[PDB]
Design an enzyme around this catalytic site. Structure first.
Site, short mmCIF file in Angstrom:
data_model
loop_
_atom_site.label_atom_id
_atom_site.label_comp_id
_atom_site.label_asym_id
_atom_site.label_seq_id
_atom_site.Cartn_x
_atom_site.Cartn_y
_atom_site.Cartn_z
N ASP A 87 0.80 -1.22 0.00
CA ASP A 87 0.00 0.00 0.00
C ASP A 87 0.84 1.27 0.00
O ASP A 87 0.29 2.38 0.04
CB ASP A 87 -0.95 0.01 1.20
CG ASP A 87 -2.06 -1.01 1.07
OD1 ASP A 87 -2.36 -1.43 -0.07
OD2 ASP A 87 -2.64 -1.40 2.11
N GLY A 88 2.16 1.13 -0.04
CA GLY A 88 3.02 2.29 -0.14
C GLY A 88 3.86 2.26 -1.40
O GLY A 88 4.23 3.30 -1.94
N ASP A 96 -11.30 19.82 11.41
CA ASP A 96 -9.91 19.45 11.19
C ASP A 96 -9.51 19.65 9.74
O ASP A 96 -8.39 20.10 9.46
CB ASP A 96 -9.68 18.01 11.63
CG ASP A 96 -9.69 17.84 13.13
OD1 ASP A 96 -10.09 18.80 13.83
OD2 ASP A 96 -9.29 16.76 13.61
#
Lengths: 299, 301, 299, 301
Positions: free
Chosen positions: C81-82, C183
């Site tokens: 996933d990276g 946020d």
């Protein structure tokens, strides 16, 4: 239950939002009222030296009578919205006198009183009996040089100047209940249930319910749902001994301290609650605040 | 705080899920132990005549010693064999003061069944003789005014649709002030014990049983903002049909008989004065969190 | 629909997570198996400089044949996933088909299992496998200079080195749809629906659905539920001309830049999607990843 | 994206909510306008039988000219007078190709009725003569296999309880692979149009009608993780009871006839080939966001 004046109150501490020009006339009128009825008035160091009120000499006739900021304070009046009472709670880390807060434009939660016809409201609260709510406060002790802080709305352990995925362990009476990932965790009072904790998908809690809220901030697990724990339990949050990129802790939007390995944050229910004065009674006031501020069930 | 025993227990009530074959042998073993230590045991008038156990040799001698419980204070200690349904039935049986109850999960670990059946010998001896930890789970007293019934609820009370079709719409009053009018599928008024019950499925927050509160949770509200709330234990709720809507509502108590509420009917909910003492294996906090992890997969990752 | 090889591929770009010893042996095996079938293998210069790869003289026989890195025709990712995000970052244009292996963590973007990879690699190169054209977002940042980054998982406009809300306006086709507080906001692809956007309470989106996800991060309004918009629409995010505390934008959880007044962030659906090779079919792979990675309804 | 009329529109079908007196005068005015410009007007059989329309002899001058629709290329344009229910009824009427529909809101803005009744002269003239903006809202083709039924739905299809009770666990297959076994109150399979419908109350994300997708959303799931998902348009869902559970389920089509589904029944859902063209006031994006702001209070603060 409502208001127990052992001796007639004589000292008032008036806290102003500061850096706001809209509050000068209300502050002046309220101070004239308080000084009229032979009742001592206390003002913060930074408020009495405000240049805007320093220039005005008409109000100066009562400036010389302002005492400067225990048990010497007996009654607190807050002029502002949802931030003045947080500052007042920050000032008093011990027992805090009854506080009434006036909303100058934004109704909020902690400011139920309306400024209009404040004559009768102030006279009634001083002389007669009003209704109070003993809002719970959290005692937070940070071990690195231990320091004690009192929190009214919430304590947030999250990212900061650095920003990677935090991973912090929460112990509850010495048992590791969970490790939380994602943007962080919020440990909040019922008063702060409508604060930032509400934005994180947490249930709203009446201030008369003794509990401590644990709420996530974007948890990486789809199942981590906010929980509440009994008031008397001791929480202990610390970095898991597997993760770098140490976390940051904030106390009701105040000084953010970086917590690293070996740091601990102990949270308990403080023995020194905050008495907030309500206009009619806790239930209707709370529900009116819910309806008017966050539009709870408008349809 | 843990267990204040007076006149150390002599009467024990055993309640079984019924219509389940897997419980027969555990029931036999529990009955044999309870008979062994000079302990009087009551069994319901509907579990005795139950077949299989009726025509079961090597146990009739045990059967003759079973005095039949009837609808007090002839019960001092309740044992539940089943999962998450036996304790609700036990609460339904005792509308007043209920003696301490421990429940055993026979395969299906739940939220009201802390004790594991394995090595129950030591656990029963310890609970009878020594001191264990108990949690006084709150209960709701509910009065339905059409006649008054005054039922007692442990997990939740649900006011929703039912044999009716569509669009339930009910007002909720709290100390006489109209806090809200709820639309959608319905409303759930639950105890902290029921925080993990059906109310949890509706997006509500899990509440430890030691927190005194009453939960109001929607069921698919048409308003995007109606978020579940909790109110103090001592406040009195009153739910009734709004005087504008047809399609009268239906109310269910702990997942049991559903009464139709129409105009002029009111449902008054308060915190009962007779909580249910549930015996925990180690302590309320760790037991509750272990249950959360094992059953609902609260924070598995 | 499955795989249109105009010409048999002759180039492989192998992307390694780096700074992880566990991937060394599978990297060696994959590189040997790719080189033995007379096919050129490309590796980044920063990857073929590690002390681990320098010390191992046994692998040196094929280290010389590594052609360092328009010319790539097939990408293999080793990591979880990276690696795919880094590969997408390197290829800002038309990216060749990418098949990724999971060495321990199944994830969402790494369906292939490393066990018996000979058959899978041969079937992918020679036969036909199934692909998913994951959507990408073109994000153009206009300062008071253009950047034109490409995003695969999400773009997050939030706080950072700053402190407070940074209320920010979102325009859609030039109409002010909303102002978001809290946020921050997340604009994500369907691929990123299971990414950080999932932590914010957003619905999981299949990669074959053309849409753009807008999801808040702890919004102060109880009603600001996440939404999706058509793929072909153009979002334009910029700070409202009323708020201080300028915001920070991050792409794919990577280098963040401060956005202030006069800055604009234009988000559109890119014309250069990412073809990801799936082992069985998009549906089964997506649902298996849902059940295995984020612990979905299975119970 | 725009309404190319090809031939000049000659026929209109006017659908009224009925059983509401407030719509009588708008219906009269709209019908006089439609009949004035030599354009044929169709009215449903049950609409031109009301006592209110029978008593008014003044309108009778145009009542005789009202052609009657029967259950289909005769209708070329549909006008709906009502809120969020007239369009559903119009969709129910036309199971095949659906002519363009313009909806007016008499008091409640809603989602599917963007047009405002005020100054309807120019709006109707511009829609008929000129070109307006249209949105092809997706519909779901749902086939119930017991005998086939072949329904078409616009907002959602709900598989849940009903005159029965309890979980009614049910399996969902998706392209032949068992994706999930949903428990709880039930499941909702909805169009993007139905994102603001009942599916919204269940915690599902709002979806613009131009995004081709199919929404699967729980109704109070017993699992804390089963969060709503979307699937591509071309998928074929197949919902049926698991071969382990009693208490058969009930299926409802946009709030309409609820049919029992038991063991051996199947419900096949796909994206229909016959979308509904809804005419917007300005453009799909602004219209959708204005409706979200006005109706559900999406981001009011």
């Amino acid at each position: 239950q409502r208001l127990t004046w052992n001796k007639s109150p004589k000292s008032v501490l008036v806290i102003k939002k500061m850096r706001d020009a809209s509050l000068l006339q209300p502050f002046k009128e309220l101070c004239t009222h308080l000084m009229e009825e032979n009742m001592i008035v206390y003002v913060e160091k930074k408020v009495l030296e405000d240049p805007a009120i320093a220039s005005d000499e008409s109000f100066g006739a009562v400036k010389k009578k302002f005492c400067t900021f225990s048990n010497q304070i007996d009654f607190i009046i807050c002029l502002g919205g949802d931030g003045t009472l947080l500052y007042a709670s920050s000032l008093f880390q011990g027992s805090v006198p009854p506080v009434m807060a006036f909303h100058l434009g934004s109704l909020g939660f902690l400011t139920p009183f309306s400024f209009e016809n404040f004559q009768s409201q102030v006279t009634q609260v001083i002389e007669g009996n009003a209704a109070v709510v003993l809002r719970s406060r959290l005692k937070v002790r940070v071990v690195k040089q231990a320091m004690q802080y009192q929190v009214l709305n919430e304590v947030v352990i999250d990212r900061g100047p650095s920003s990677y995925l935090s991973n912090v362990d929460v112990y509850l009476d010495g048992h590791l209940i969970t490790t939380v990932q994602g943007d962080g965790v919020i440990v909040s009072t019922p008063t702060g249930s409508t604060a930032y904790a509400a934005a994180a998908g947490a249930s709203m809690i009446h201030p008369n319910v003794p509990a401590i809220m644990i709420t996530p901030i974007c948890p990486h697990s789809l199942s981590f749902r906010p929980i509440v724990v009994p008031a008397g339990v001791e929480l202990k949050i610390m970095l898991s001994p597997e993760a770098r990129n140490t976390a940051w802790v904030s106390f009701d939007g105040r000084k953010r301290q970086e917590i690293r390995h070996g740091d601990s944050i102990s949270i308990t229910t403080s023995c020194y609650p905050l008495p907030s004065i309500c206009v009619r009674d806790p239930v209707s006031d709370w529900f009116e605040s819910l309806a008017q501020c966050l539009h709870w069930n408008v349809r």
